[PDB]
């Protein structure tokens, strides 16, 4: 993969999703398909979820925080 | 299997729903897994917001499968 997600883990990231969703969370886990596991997940649509899993296939953009 | 039960109606009048509130009725001539379609003697109705427009194509319209929602009989 072109992005080394290893650095990010235990770091707060900002992910845009296809369909106009923003999510900010703490990167707990990830895969080669770019599915993520986020912690303290807040979804800006304020919406608070917790430990979420984000489908890599709709993962549209990813920055830090 | 759902694609075979479509072979079932070949040469049999069919009713087709497409994205964008359009509806076709015509005689099934051909289809593919993509549910691409050829129909003949087919009338299309477009509902635009309420009015409905029509369009006739007797000879043989082809239809790209990706717009297709439903395929049944009138």
């Amino acid at each position: 993969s072109i992005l080394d997600l290893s650095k990010y883990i235990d770091k707060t990231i900002r992910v845009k999703f296809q369909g106009g969703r923003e999510a900010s969370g703490i990167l707990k886990g990830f895969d080669p398909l770019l599915n993520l596991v986020l912690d303290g997940t807040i979804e800006y649509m304020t919406r608070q979820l917790g430990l979420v899993v984000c489908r890599g296939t709709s993962v549209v953009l990813i920055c830090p925080q | 299997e759902p694609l075979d039960l479509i072979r079932l109606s070949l040469d049999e009048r069919i009713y087709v729903k497409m994205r964008n509130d359009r509806e076709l009725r015509g005689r099934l001539h051909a289809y593919d897994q993509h549910l691409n379609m050829i129909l003949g003697d087919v009338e299309e109705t477009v509902t635009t917001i309420i009015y409905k427009s029509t369009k006739r194509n007797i000879p043989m319209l082809f239809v790209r499968g990706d717009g297709v929602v439903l395929v049944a009989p009138p």
Partner: protein, 74 residues
């Protein structure tokens, strides 16, 4: 030359990506793959300055290249 090759060798250049979203992104290019997924450094995004960004290929509309481009890769 092919889009992908062009990007592949435009590594280290500056470019401006339009998203399907309507978002403009100004950055220097760091990595590209065959899906056209991008990583950029020194980033500014317009509806925000960031260190690094990742962009899925399927969400790009078009990429403005620096005019240097042809001479820099080739």
């Amino acid at each position: 030359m092919l889009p992908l090759s062009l990007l592949k060798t435009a590594q280290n250049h500056p470019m401006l990506v339009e998203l399907k979203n309507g978002e403009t992104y100004n950055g220097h290019l760091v990595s590209c793959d065959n899906w056209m997924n991008i990583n950029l450094r020194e980033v500014i995004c317009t509806s925000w300055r960031m260190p690094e960004c990742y962009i899925r290929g399927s969400t790009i509309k078009y990429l403005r290249i620096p005019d240097e481009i042809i001479d820099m890769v080739k």
